[model samples]
Target: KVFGRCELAAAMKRHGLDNYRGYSLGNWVCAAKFESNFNTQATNRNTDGSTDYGILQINSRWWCNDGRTPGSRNLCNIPCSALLSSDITASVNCAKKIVSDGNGMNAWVAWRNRCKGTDVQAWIRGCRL
Candidate 1:
């Protein structure tokens, strides 16, 4: 939730997802910045009756379970609240599943609109690996 950019990059690397699905760790970092701004507690009620949860803003409609949220496919079999933790294991795993589901980084709209085809060195700058 409170991850600095380097911390996130390192975590992604440890998860074996730094370049998973052909997207760079920087891309994922960019997505986190826009999706939830690195805030694990971030949640957005969607127009389609779903909720976006966690740093990646994974949707409740398909990837996560929120007891009160409707239409949850729960493909990731994870609780939405788990994603809101500073620990990122569940979030990273679910995001990997999402990328494997053919969305790549495109599963996150923020990555599509903001990080697509963009140079992202700045996102990783000033951080020791």
Candidate 2:
């Protein structure tokens, strides 16, 4: 499922992404836009053979267990496939774990390059959080 901007914002907020780990809802929304373009089923294989899954592109290397990434920690304790679900609950939870683990939003390069230190408020301007 490809979610609209406001749709993704609402969903992420509902899942407790708002201000999680000092990142605002706009930060999350902006990251999602650049990471996977709001496509729930998005997946990208990294050079290390690890894959990123879902809208936020949670990686298999240290987050989800894909049974393919070498030495995967599976810290999120969920199958990598779960992140591809359109419901997004698993993806959001895994993201939270990534931040709670002290990685912060910088865990996603897209967020660091695009959303970080920017006026991300425009990303959620029209959306009612």
Candidate 3:
């Protein structure tokens, strides 16, 4: 599913992403914009034999197991395929684990490169959440 900006923000908030580990809802929204353009089925293969999946583009190497990523930690304890679902429940849960597991939002390169140090509130500009 490709979510509209405000819709995605609302969903993220519903999943407890708002201020999770000091990262605001806007931060997650901004990251999703760059990572997958709010598309839940997005996937990208890395040069290191791992893949990124879902709206936030969680990586297979350290987060989810794909059975192809060498040395996958599967820290999220979910199959990589789970991230591709349009429901986004698994994706949000894994993302929350990523944030709380000490990486914060920096677990996503898109967040670090684009959302970090920026006024991400613009991403949720008209959203009431």
Tell me the deviation in Å of residue 53 in model 1: 0.6
* Candidate 3 displacement at residue 122 in angstroms: 0.7
Residue 60 shift from truth in candidate 3, angstroms: 0.7
Kindly provide the TM-score of model 3 when superposed on the true structure, using C-alpha atoms. Answer: 0.95
Better of 2 and 3 by lDDT: 2
Per-residue lDDT for 12-129 in model 2, tens only? 8998888887788999999999999999999999899899999999999899999999989999999999999989899988898998898888899999999888999898898866
Instruction: Give the winner by TM-score.
Output: 2
- Per-residue error at 104 for model 1, in Å? 1.7
Instruction: Order candidates by lDDT, high to low.
Output: 2, 3, 1
Cα displacement (Å) at residue 77, model 2 = 0.2
Go through the candidates in order and give the C-alpha RMSD of each one to the true structure. 1.4, 0.9, 1.0
**Ranking 1 against 2 by TM-score, winner:** 2
lDDT string, candidate 3, 19-121, tens digits: 8888888998999999999999899988999989989898998999999999989999999999999887999999888877887777788889998999999
What shift in Å separates residue 102 of candidate 1 from its native position after superposition? 1.9
Q: What local lDDT does model 3 show for residue 55? A: 90
The top-ranked prediction according to lDDT is 2
